[PDB]
């Protein structure tokens, strides 16, 4: 009786665990939504080669 | 006198959780960054729309 | 012999220092791929201000 410990919850007093898998899928999010962008962007790159080509 | 504990700092060994926040916001900035480039792609979208009604 | 304590691995609980720093480079991923994307977006920038002249 003297050098006692508490409860040490390292799987509580973490609780980020359940924000990195959230922040990664929202990075997913992301990634496809350039890849939704860069979709818009194929437009313009053929909108300035065939679409232009009346002169 | 025997088995003892050092000191348990939850909240300074991991440090992370001020990283989490820092990145939560950082994809913010991005998916902004997404509406902002969406935007431009709005664009492209009129472009080959009416602006492409010469021919 | 009474209160011990068990092995408290702060630096092994957690396991996400190596995710935070992964996570970090993925967001610099899509920032880097809004850049790209928004250079496509000059692209549309450029067809409805000169390109588009021909009436």
Redesign the interface.
């Given at each position: 009786?003297?050098?006692?410990?508490?409860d040490?919850?390292?799987?509580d007093?973490?609780g980020?665990?359940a924000?990195?898998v959230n922040?990664?899928k929202?990075?997913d999010?992301?990634?496809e939504?350039?890849k939704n962008?860069?979709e818009?962007?194929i437009?313009?790159?053929?909108?300035?080669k065939y679409?232009?080509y009346?002169?």
């Open positions: 009786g003297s050098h006692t410990s508490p040490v919850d390292l799987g007093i973490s980020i665990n924000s990195v922040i990664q929202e990075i999010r992301l990634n939504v350039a962008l860069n818009s962007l437009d313009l790159q053929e909108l300035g679409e232009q009346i002169k």
